[PDB]
């Protein structure tokens, strides 16, 4: 298996771990803050997914410092993981185009 | 914090008649309301979760409705075992808050 | 099996401190939160605080006076609430509840009746209540047990180790000179007594004394 | 050190400077506008991060012209920086695939 | 602009009793409310920041609660030094606004 495909699969597994850990740590950080809505794990996981994908509907958002720091990690992990997937697709296309050119 | 008003505090119903309990939230909480039953010298017992979802072991006559700020706990054909206090509790915003409670008398 | 196990009662002197318990059993996950709810006699439910035992962070209700400290012990699966500087306003029933991190309290404990007083613990006295020699009995017959002179609350009275619950009334206690007093009624068919034994089981957790008392006819 | 990794590290440092400068300049631009909520630095920094990552929850948003112009710079800086990271990953994968092919 | 109503203007409390000050906001401001104390011929003094956060030097009897539109400043066991005016101030939307003020008398 080539590196870029192994790295993509590794990034996908790492992203799932960030989503699960991010959902657990957000609830742990948001409870205790009056008005916080990111205080139950099922919707916290939904919030983490729409954060890593950078969709950000606005139905859920962190208000505490550590809840927002968790959000930052989720954002970077999601942007990086999907970016590595795009990078792997580019390598696949470039490698196929080299063979298409004989070189 | 979120305020949960239950009015009226006492509901008088004759046997075998439907009875509805009211729980109003100071702000919209979607469907994050939960109902509990407490008989005399007893611990609270979960009846309905998330406004309208059933709980295993709870009789079929118990149901719930509503979303937003107004929520209802309905008991089809009230019986003597249903004589207790009924509380609502929200889980949308921290901290979790309870309602003042509504007593059912027959 | 019961999921949350709490003591029966705790007598605290005014200003003294107490630590309550709540032994957890059944399924336990890392997403569990233990909550504490306060209920004074003649009042609704009042949220005190929460704690996640898999991490040790505790949150408290910021609307009320903070008189609690929540700890957890994963080796024994028991959460603790330490109440400090108690007055009469703190005398209530304190429940513990388990939340699976999804909002609602799926299971509650029996609650620990906390009584803040300056008095002293007194075990109760149980007396039989049988009809007099001249008493016309119908198809049924009513017997009783008198629980007087105990402090503090509560007392849990059962009939025949709990096997008799239909036709059982237990009246609330009355306070008379730092002592409580109540009675419990039981209505068995007239033919069943006194052939089949009828006893009352008066348990006073504040004094760790559970007492039985058989109801035999007079002469 | 190869260029694409040095450029990635440079982009990350530049992004942090944009976030900090964007948070300072947003508060400076939003105060004076009635109804504006982007008027304190701690949450302004949180708004800048969720802007550069393009998450955009909606809890904070600028209303003034210069507060929105600051937002535009934050958006471009965030999209470009994370894009340069993806570009560097593609070069890493393509360079590794050339060695995997002997060429 | 955001309106901060403090009612009632005067609170009468006997010594050694808890007293709660009310501050209601015309619209939701999360927890961006701050409490101040001003004695006679004195400058305002910060007591509570962000609804419920303590300040160094402020006695332990001062606390705060609430989120959204309703906010409370509580004083456990009032003392003679607590006789002053109490203002709330919001920082959620520009411009910052103050409450009308509530006087405490013993
Ligand atoms: C790919 C990830 C899928 C995202 C959709 C999740 C929607 C959650 C929800 O809207 O939930 C909907 C549903 C009820 O409507 O919730 C439920 O019960 C069913 C979902 C349960 C998922 C939560 C399990 C634990 C969450 C992990 C955080 C760390 C735990 C420790
Ligand atoms: C990577 C950047 C991390 C983004 C999370 C920031 C959350 C801020 C917050 O929710 O804050 C939460 C926390 C209070 O809840 O704020 C605090 O005090 C602690 C955070 C202080 C950070 C602000 C310092 C100055 C901001 C720089 C702007 C230019 C200044 C001149
Ligand atoms: C169709 C989804 C494209 C979203 N992107 C990249 C995905 C990252 C999860 C956001 C990057 C922002 C750092 C690109 C938007 C560029 C306008
Ligand atoms: C970004 C690191 C995870 C956040 C740390 C745990 C959450 C704080 C709990 O107080
Ligand atoms: C995008 C350039 C930064 C914005 C200029 C400072 C903010 C305006 C202050 O009036």
Coordinates of N, CA and C in Angstrom, one line a residue, chain C:
Chain C
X1 N -31.4 -5.6 41.4 CA -30.7 -5.0 42.5 C -30.9 -3.4 42.4
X2 N -30.9 -2.8 43.6 CA -31.0 -1.4 43.7 C -29.7 -0.7 43.1
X3 N -29.9 0.3 42.3 CA -28.7 0.9 41.6 C -28.0 2.0 42.5
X4 N -28.7 2.8 43.3 CA -28.2 3.8 44.1 C -28.6 3.5 45.5
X5 N -27.7 3.4 46.5 CA -27.9 3.0 47.8 C -27.5 4.1 48.8
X6 N -28.4 4.7 49.5 CA -28.2 5.8 50.4 C -28.6 5.4 51.8
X7 N -27.9 6.0 52.8 CA -28.3 5.8 54.2 C -29.7 6.3 54.5
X8 N -30.3 5.8 55.6 CA -31.7 6.2 56.0 C -31.8 7.6 56.5
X9 N -30.9 8.0 57.4 CA -31.0 9.3 58.0 C -29.7 9.7 58.6
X10 N -29.5 11.0 58.9 CA -28.3 11.5 59.5 C -28.7 12.7 60.4
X11 N -28.4 12.6 61.7 CA -28.7 13.6 62.7 C -27.5 14.5 62.8
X12 N -27.6 15.8 62.5 CA -26.5 16.7 62.5 C -26.9 17.9 63.5
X13 N -25.9 18.2 64.3 CA -26.1 19.4 65.2 C -25.9 20.7 64.4
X14 N -26.6 21.7 64.9 CA -26.5 23.0 64.2 C -25.1 23.5 64.1
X15 N -24.6 23.7 62.9 CA -23.2 24.1 62.6 C -22.3 23.0 62.3
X16 N -22.6 21.8 62.7 CA -21.8 20.6 62.4 C -21.9 20.3 60.9
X17 N -21.0 19.3 60.5 CA -20.9 18.9 59.1 C -21.2 17.4 59.0
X18 N -21.7 17.0 57.8 CA -22.0 15.6 57.6 C -21.6 15.3 56.1
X19 N -21.3 14.0 55.9 CA -21.0 13.5 54.6 C -21.9 12.3 54.2
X20 N -22.7 12.5 53.2 CA -23.6 11.5 52.7 C -23.0 10.6 51.7
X21 N -23.6 9.5 51.4 CA -23.1 8.5 50.5 C -24.2 8.1 49.5
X22 N -23.7 7.4 48.4 CA -24.6 6.9 47.4 C -23.9 5.8 46.6
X23 N -23.9 4.6 47.1 CA -23.3 3.5 46.5 C -23.9 3.1 45.1
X24 N -23.1 3.1 44.1 CA -23.7 2.8 42.7 C -23.4 1.4 42.3
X25 N -24.4 0.7 41.7 CA -24.2 -0.6 41.2 C -24.8 -0.6 39.8
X26 N -24.9 -1.8 39.2 CA -25.3 -1.9 37.8 C -24.3 -1.4 36.8
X27 N -24.7 -1.2 35.6 CA -23.8 -0.7 34.5 C -23.3 0.7 34.9
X28 N -22.0 0.8 34.8 CA -21.3 2.1 35.0 C -20.4 2.4 33.8
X29 N -20.6 3.6 33.2 CA -19.9 4.1 32.0 C -19.0 5.3 32.4
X30 N -18.1 5.6 31.5 CA -17.3 6.8 31.7 C -18.1 8.1 31.5
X31 N -19.3 8.0 31.0 CA -20.2 9.1 30.7 C -21.2 9.3 31.8
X32 N -21.0 8.7 33.0 CA -22.0 8.8 34.1 C -21.8 10.1 34.9
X33 N -22.9 10.7 35.2 CA -22.9 11.9 36.1 C -23.8 11.5 37.3
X34 N -23.3 11.8 38.5 CA -24.1 11.6 39.7 C -24.6 13.0 40.2
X35 N -25.9 13.1 40.3 CA -26.5 14.4 40.7 C -27.1 14.2 42.1
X36 N -27.3 15.4 42.8 CA -27.9 15.4 44.1 C -29.0 16.4 44.1
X37 N -30.2 16.0 44.6 CA -31.4 16.8 44.6 C -31.8 17.0 46.1
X38 N -32.2 18.2 46.5 CA -32.6 18.5 47.8 C -34.1 18.8 47.8
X39 N -34.8 18.2 48.7 CA -36.3 18.4 48.8 C -36.7 18.6 50.3
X40 N -37.0 19.8 50.7 CA -37.5 20.0 52.0 C -38.9 19.6 52.2
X41 N -39.3 19.2 53.4 CA -40.7 18.8 53.6 C -41.7 19.9 53.2
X42 N -42.6 19.6 52.3 CA -43.5 20.6 51.7 C -42.9 21.5 50.7
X43 N -41.9 21.0 49.9 CA -41.3 21.7 48.8 C -41.0 20.8 47.6
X44 N -40.7 21.4 46.5 CA -40.4 20.7 45.3 C -39.0 20.2 45.3
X45 N -38.5 19.8 44.1 CA -37.1 19.3 44.0 C -36.2 20.4 43.6
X46 N -35.0 20.4 44.2 CA -34.0 21.5 44.1 C -32.7 20.9 43.7
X47 N -32.2 21.2 42.6 CA -30.9 20.7 42.1 C -29.8 21.3 42.9
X48 N -28.9 20.4 43.3 CA -27.7 20.9 44.1 C -26.5 20.9 43.3
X49 N -26.1 19.8 42.7 CA -24.9 19.7 41.9 C -24.7 18.4 41.3
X50 N -23.6 18.3 40.5 CA -23.3 17.1 39.7 C -21.8 16.8 39.8
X51 N -21.5 15.6 39.5 CA -20.1 15.2 39.4 C -19.9 14.0 38.4
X52 N -18.9 14.0 37.7 CA -18.5 12.9 36.8 C -17.4 12.1 37.4
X53 N -17.7 10.9 37.9 CA -16.7 10.1 38.6 C -15.5 9.7 37.7
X54 N -15.7 9.6 36.4 CA -14.6 9.2 35.6 C -13.6 10.4 35.4
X55 N -13.8 11.5 35.9 CA -12.9 12.7 35.9 C -12.8 13.4 37.1
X56 N -13.8 13.5 38.0 CA -13.7 14.2 39.3 C -14.2 15.6 39.3
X57 N -14.6 16.2 38.1 CA -15.1 17.6 38.1 C -16.5 17.6 38.7
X58 N -16.8 18.6 39.5 CA -18.1 18.8 40.1 C -18.6 20.2 39.9
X59 N -19.9 20.3 39.5 CA -20.5 21.6 39.3 C -21.6 21.7 40.3
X60 N -22.0 23.0 40.7 CA -22.9 23.3 41.7 C -23.9 24.3 41.2
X61 N -25.1 24.3 41.8 CA -26.1 25.3 41.5 C -25.7 26.6 42.1
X62 N -25.6 27.6 41.2 CA -25.1 28.9 41.6 C -26.2 29.8 42.1
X63 N -27.5 29.4 42.0 CA -28.6 30.2 42.6 C -28.7 30.1 44.1
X64 N -28.3 29.0 44.7 CA -28.5 28.7 46.1 C -27.2 28.9 46.8
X65 N -27.3 28.8 48.1 CA -26.1 28.9 49.0 C -25.3 27.6 48.8
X66 N -24.0 27.7 48.6 CA -23.1 26.6 48.3 C -22.7 26.0 49.7
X67 N -23.3 24.9 50.1 CA -22.9 24.2 51.3 C -22.5 22.7 51.1
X68 N -22.2 22.4 49.9 CA -21.9 21.0 49.5 C -20.6 20.9 48.8
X69 N -20.0 19.7 48.9 CA -18.7 19.4 48.2 C -18.9 17.9 47.7
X70 N -18.8 17.8 46.4 CA -19.1 16.5 45.8 C -17.7 15.8 45.4
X71 N -17.6 14.6 46.0 CA -16.4 13.7 45.7 C -16.9 12.4 45.1
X72 N -16.0 11.6 44.5 CA -16.3 10.3 44.0 C -15.1 9.4 44.2
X73 N -15.5 8.1 44.3 CA -14.5 7.0 44.6 C -14.7 5.9 43.6
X74 N -13.9 5.8 42.6 CA -14.1 4.8 41.5 C -13.8 3.4 42.0
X75 N -13.0 3.2 43.0 CA -12.7 1.9 43.5 C -13.8 1.2 44.2
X76 N -14.7 2.0 44.8 CA -15.9 1.5 45.5 C -17.2 1.9 44.8
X77 N -17.1 2.7 43.7 CA -18.3 3.1 43.0 C -19.3 3.9 43.9
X78 N -18.8 4.8 44.7 CA -19.6 5.6 45.6 C -19.3 7.0 45.6
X79 N -20.3 7.9 45.4 CA -20.2 9.3 45.4 C -20.5 9.8 46.8
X80 N -19.9 11.0 47.1 CA -20.1 11.5 48.5 C -20.4 13.0 48.4
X81 N -21.4 13.4 49.2 CA -21.7 14.9 49.3 C -21.5 15.3 50.7
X82 N -20.6 16.2 50.9 CA -20.2 16.7 52.2 C -20.9 18.1 52.5
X83 N -21.8 18.1 53.4 CA -22.6 19.3 53.8 C -21.9 19.9 55.0
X84 N -21.7 21.2 55.0 CA -21.0 21.9 56.1 C -21.8 23.0 56.6
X85 N -21.7 23.3 57.9 CA -22.4 24.4 58.6 C -23.9 24.4 58.3
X86 N -24.6 23.4 58.9 CA -26.0 23.1 58.7 C -26.8 23.8 59.7
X87 N -27.9 24.4 59.2 CA -29.0 25.0 60.0 C -30.3 24.3 59.8
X88 N -31.4 24.8 60.4 CA -32.7 24.2 60.2 C -33.1 24.3 58.7
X89 N -32.7 25.3 58.0 CA -33.0 25.4 56.6 C -32.4 24.3 55.7
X90 N -31.4 23.6 56.2 CA -30.8 22.5 55.5 C -31.4 21.2 55.8
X91 N -32.4 21.1 56.7 CA -33.0 19.8 57.0 C -34.0 19.5 55.9
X92 N -33.7 18.4 55.1 CA -34.4 18.0 54.0 C -34.1 16.6 53.7
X93 N -34.8 16.1 52.6 CA -34.4 14.7 52.0 C -33.5 15.0 50.8
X94 N -32.4 14.3 50.9 CA -31.3 14.5 49.8 C -31.3 13.2 49.0
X95 N -31.7 13.3 47.7 CA -31.6 12.2 46.8 C -30.3 12.3 46.0
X96 N -29.8 11.1 45.5 CA -28.8 11.0 44.5 C -29.4 10.4 43.3
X97 N -29.0 10.8 42.1 CA -29.5 10.3 40.8 C -28.4 10.1 39.9
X98 N -28.6 9.1 39.0 CA -27.6 8.8 38.0 C -28.1 9.3 36.6
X99 N -27.3 10.1 35.9 CA -27.6 10.6 34.6 C -26.5 10.0 33.6
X100 N -27.0 9.4 32.5 CA -26.1 8.8 31.6 C -25.5 9.8 30.6
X101 N -25.4 11.1 31.1 CA -24.9 12.1 30.2 C -25.8 12.6 29.1
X102 N -27.1 12.2 29.1 CA -28.1 12.5 28.1 C -29.2 13.3 28.7
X103 N -29.1 13.9 29.9 CA -30.1 14.9 30.3 C -30.9 14.5 31.5
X104 N -31.6 13.4 31.4 CA -32.6 13.0 32.4 C -31.9 12.1 33.5
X105 N -32.6 12.0 34.6 CA -32.2 11.1 35.7 C -32.9 9.8 35.6
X106 N -32.2 8.8 35.1 CA -32.9 7.5 34.8 C -33.2 6.8 36.1
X107 N -32.4 6.9 37.2 CA -32.6 6.2 38.4 C -32.3 7.1 39.6
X108 N -33.1 7.0 40.6 CA -32.9 7.8 41.8 C -32.6 6.9 43.0
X109 N -32.0 7.5 44.0 CA -31.8 6.7 45.3 C -33.0 6.9 46.2
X110 N -32.9 6.2 47.3 CA -34.0 6.3 48.3 C -34.0 7.6 49.0
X111 N -32.8 8.3 49.1 CA -32.7 9.5 49.8 C -32.4 9.4 51.3
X112 N -31.6 10.3 51.8 CA -31.2 10.3 53.2 C -31.9 11.5 53.9
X113 N -32.8 11.2 54.8 CA -33.5 12.3 55.6 C -32.5 12.9 56.5
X114 N -32.1 14.1 56.2 CA -31.1 14.9 57.1 C -31.9 15.8 58.0
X115 N -31.8 15.6 59.3 CA -32.5 16.4 60.3 C -31.4 17.2 61.1
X116 N -31.4 18.5 61.0 CA -30.5 19.3 61.8 C -31.2 19.8 63.1
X117 N -30.8 19.3 64.2 CA -31.4 19.6 65.5 C -30.4 19.5 66.6
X118 N -30.8 20.1 67.8 CA -30.0 20.0 68.9 C -30.3 18.9 69.9
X119 N -31.3 18.1 69.5 CA -31.8 17.0 70.4 C -30.8 15.8 70.5
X120 N -31.4 14.7 70.8 CA -30.6 13.4 70.9 C -31.4 12.3 70.2
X121 N -30.7 11.3 69.7 CA -31.3 10.2 69.0 C -32.0 9.3 70.0
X122 N -33.3 9.0 69.8 CA -34.1 8.2 70.7 C -34.7 7.1 69.8
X123 N -34.4 5.8 70.1 CA -35.1 4.7 69.4 C -36.6 4.7 69.8
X124 N -37.4 4.2 68.9 CA -38.9 4.2 69.1 C -39.3 3.1 70.0
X125 N -40.6 3.2 70.4 CA -41.3 2.2 71.2 C -42.5 1.7 70.5
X126 N -42.7 0.4 70.2 CA -43.8 -0.2 69.5 C -44.7 -0.9 70.4
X127 N -46.0 -0.6 70.2 CA -47.1 -1.2 71.1 C -48.2 -1.8 70.2
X128 N -48.7 -3.0 70.6 CA -49.7 -3.6 69.8 C -51.0 -2.8 69.9
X129 N -51.9 -2.9 68.9 CA -53.2 -2.3 68.9 C -54.2 -3.4 68.5
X130 N -54.8 -4.0 69.4 CA -55.9 -5.0 69.2 C -57.2 -4.5 69.7
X131 N -58.3 -5.0 69.1 CA -59.6 -4.5 69.6 C -59.9 -5.0 71.0
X132 N -60.7 -4.2 71.7 CA -61.1 -4.6 73.1 C -62.0 -5.8 73.1
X133 N -62.2 -6.2 74.4 CA -63.0 -7.4 74.6 C -64.4 -7.3 74.0
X134 N -65.0 -6.1 74.1 CA -66.3 -5.8 73.6 C -66.2 -5.0 72.3
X135 N -66.2 -5.7 71.2 CA -66.1 -5.1 69.9 C -66.6 -6.0 68.8
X136 N -67.7 -5.5 68.2 CA -68.3 -6.3 67.1 C -67.5 -6.2 65.9
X137 N -67.1 -7.3 65.3 CA -66.2 -7.3 64.1 C -67.0 -7.7 62.9
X138 N -66.8 -7.0 61.8 CA -67.5 -7.4 60.5 C -66.7 -8.4 59.8
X139 N -66.8 -8.4 58.4 CA -66.0 -9.4 57.6 C -64.5 -9.1 57.7
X140 N -64.1 -7.9 58.0 CA -62.7 -7.5 58.1 C -62.4 -7.2 59.6
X141 N -61.1 -7.0 59.9 CA -60.7 -6.5 61.2 C -59.4 -5.7 61.0
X142 N -59.4 -4.6 61.8 CA -58.3 -3.6 61.7 C -57.4 -3.8 62.9
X143 N -56.1 -3.9 62.7 CA -55.0 -3.9 63.7 C -54.1 -2.8 63.5
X144 N -53.2 -2.6 64.5 CA -52.3 -1.4 64.4 C -51.1 -1.6 65.2
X145 N -50.1 -0.7 65.0 CA -48.9 -0.5 65.8 C -48.6 0.9 66.1
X146 N -48.3 1.2 67.3 CA -48.1 2.6 67.8 C -46.6 2.8 67.9
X147 N -46.0 3.7 67.1 CA -44.6 4.0 67.1 C -44.5 5.4 67.7
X148 N -44.1 5.5 69.0 CA -44.0 6.8 69.7 C -42.6 7.0 70.3
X149 N -42.3 8.2 70.6 CA -41.1 8.6 71.3 C -39.8 8.3 70.6
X150 N -39.7 8.6 69.3 CA -38.5 8.5 68.5 C -38.1 9.8 67.9
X151 N -36.8 9.9 67.7 CA -36.1 11.1 67.1 C -34.7 10.7 66.6
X152 N -34.4 11.1 65.4 CA -35.2 11.9 64.5 C -36.0 11.0 63.5
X153 N -36.6 11.6 62.5 CA -37.3 10.9 61.4 C -36.2 10.2 60.5
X154 N -36.6 9.2 59.7 CA -38.0 8.6 59.6 C -38.1 7.3 60.3
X155 N -39.2 6.6 60.2 CA -39.4 5.2 60.6 C -40.2 4.6 59.4
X156 N -39.7 3.4 59.0 CA -40.3 2.6 57.9 C -41.0 1.4 58.6
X157 N -42.3 1.4 58.6 CA -43.1 0.3 59.2 C -43.7 -0.5 58.1
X158 N -43.4 -1.8 58.1 CA -44.0 -2.8 57.2 C -44.8 -3.8 58.0
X159 N -45.6 -4.6 57.3 CA -46.5 -5.6 58.0 C -46.2 -6.9 57.4
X160 N -45.7 -7.8 58.3 CA -45.3 -9.2 57.9 C -44.2 -9.2 56.9
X161 N -43.1 -8.5 57.2 CA -41.9 -8.3 56.4 C -42.2 -7.8 55.0
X162 N -43.2 -7.0 54.9 CA -43.6 -6.5 53.6 C -44.7 -7.3 52.8
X163 N -44.9 -8.5 53.2 CA -45.9 -9.3 52.5 C -47.3 -8.8 52.6
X164 N -47.6 -7.9 53.5 CA -48.9 -7.3 53.7 C -48.8 -5.8 53.5
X165 N -49.4 -5.4 52.3 CA -49.3 -4.0 52.0 C -50.7 -3.4 51.6
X166 N -51.6 -4.3 51.1 CA -53.0 -3.9 50.9 C -53.7 -3.7 52.2
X167 N -54.4 -2.6 52.3 CA -55.1 -2.3 53.5 C -54.2 -1.8 54.6
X168 N -53.0 -1.2 54.3 CA -52.1 -0.7 55.2 C -52.1 0.8 55.1
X169 N -52.3 1.5 56.3 CA -52.2 2.9 56.4 C -51.1 3.2 57.4
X170 N -50.2 4.2 57.1 CA -49.2 4.7 58.0 C -49.4 6.2 58.1
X171 N -49.9 6.7 59.3 CA -50.1 8.1 59.4 C -48.8 8.9 59.7
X172 N -48.8 10.1 59.2 CA -47.6 10.9 59.5 C -47.3 11.2 61.0
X173 N -46.1 11.4 61.3 CA -45.7 11.6 62.7 C -46.1 13.0 63.2
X174 N -46.3 13.1 64.5 CA -46.5 14.4 65.2 C -45.4 14.6 66.2
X175 N -44.9 15.9 66.2 CA -43.8 16.2 67.0 C -44.3 16.7 68.4
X176 N -43.9 16.1 69.5 CA -44.3 16.4 70.8 C -43.1 16.3 71.7
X177 N -42.6 17.5 72.1 CA -41.4 17.6 73.0 C -40.2 16.9 72.5
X178 N -39.7 17.3 71.3 CA -38.6 16.7 70.6 C -38.7 15.2 70.4
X179 N -39.9 14.7 70.3 CA -40.2 13.3 70.0 C -41.3 13.1 69.0
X180 N -41.2 12.2 68.1 CA -42.2 11.9 67.1 C -43.1 10.7 67.6
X181 N -44.3 10.6 67.0 CA -45.2 9.6 67.3 C -46.1 9.4 66.1
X182 N -46.3 8.1 65.7 CA -47.2 7.8 64.6 C -47.8 6.4 64.9
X183 N -48.8 6.1 64.1 CA -49.4 4.8 64.1 C -49.6 4.2 62.7
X184 N -49.7 2.9 62.6 CA -49.9 2.2 61.3 C -51.1 1.3 61.4
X185 N -51.9 1.4 60.4 CA -53.1 0.5 60.3 C -53.0 -0.6 59.4
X186 N -53.6 -1.7 59.6 CA -53.7 -2.9 58.7 C -55.0 -3.5 58.9
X187 N -55.6 -3.9 57.7 CA -57.0 -4.5 57.7 C -56.9 -5.8 57.0
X188 N -56.9 -6.9 57.8 CA -57.0 -8.3 57.3 C -58.4 -8.8 57.5
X189 N -58.8 -9.8 56.7 CA -60.1 -10.4 57.0 C -60.2 -11.0 58.4
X190 N -61.4 -10.9 58.9 CA -61.7 -11.3 60.3 C -61.3 -12.8 60.5
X191 N -61.5 -13.6 59.5 CA -61.3 -15.1 59.6 C -59.8 -15.4 59.7
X192 N -58.9 -14.5 59.1 CA -57.5 -14.8 59.0 C -56.8 -14.5 60.3
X193 N -57.4 -13.7 61.2 CA -56.8 -13.3 62.5 C -57.6 -13.9 63.6
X194 N -56.9 -14.5 64.7 CA -55.5 -14.5 64.9 C -54.8 -15.8 64.5
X195 N -55.5 -16.6 63.6 CA -55.0 -17.9 63.1 C -53.7 -17.6 62.4
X196 N -53.7 -16.7 61.4 CA -52.5 -16.3 60.6 C -51.9 -15.1 61.4
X197 N -50.6 -15.2 61.7 CA -50.0 -14.2 62.5 C -49.9 -12.8 61.7
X198 N -50.0 -11.7 62.5 CA -49.9 -10.4 61.9 C -48.9 -9.6 62.8
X199 N -47.8 -9.2 62.2 CA -46.7 -8.5 62.9 C -46.4 -7.2 62.1
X200 N -45.9 -6.2 62.8 CA -45.4 -5.0 62.2 C -43.9 -4.9 62.4
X201 N -43.2 -4.4 61.3 CA -41.8 -4.3 61.3 C -41.4 -2.8 61.3
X202 N -41.1 -2.3 62.5 CA -40.7 -0.8 62.6 C -39.2 -0.7 62.6
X203 N -38.7 -0.1 61.5 CA -37.3 0.2 61.3 C -37.0 1.7 61.5
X204 N -36.1 2.0 62.4 CA -35.7 3.4 62.7 C -34.2 3.5 62.3
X205 N -33.9 3.9 61.1 CA -32.5 3.9 60.6 C -31.6 4.8 61.4
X206 N -32.2 5.9 62.0 CA -31.3 6.9 62.7 C -30.7 6.2 64.0
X207 N -31.3 5.2 64.5 CA -30.8 4.5 65.7 C -30.3 3.1 65.3
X208 N -30.4 2.7 64.0 CA -30.0 1.4 63.6 C -30.8 0.3 64.3
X209 N -32.1 0.5 64.5 CA -32.9 -0.5 65.3 C -34.1 -0.8 64.4
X210 N -34.3 -2.0 64.1 CA -35.6 -2.5 63.5 C -36.2 -3.5 64.4
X211 N -37.5 -3.2 64.8 CA -38.2 -4.0 65.8 C -39.5 -4.6 65.2
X212 N -39.7 -5.8 65.5 CA -41.0 -6.5 65.2 C -41.9 -6.5 66.4
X213 N -43.2 -6.7 66.1 CA -44.2 -6.7 67.2 C -45.4 -7.5 66.7
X214 N -45.7 -8.6 67.3 CA -46.9 -9.4 66.9 C -48.1 -8.8 67.5
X215 N -49.3 -9.0 66.8 CA -50.5 -8.5 67.3 C -51.4 -9.7 67.7
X216 N -51.5 -9.9 69.0 CA -52.3 -11.0 69.5 C -53.5 -10.5 70.2
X217 N -54.6 -11.2 70.2 CA -55.8 -10.6 70.8 C -55.7 -10.5 72.3
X218 N -56.6 -9.6 72.9 CA -56.6 -9.3 74.3 C -57.4 -10.4 75.0
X219 N -56.7 -11.2 75.9 CA -57.3 -12.2 76.7 C -58.2 -13.2 75.9

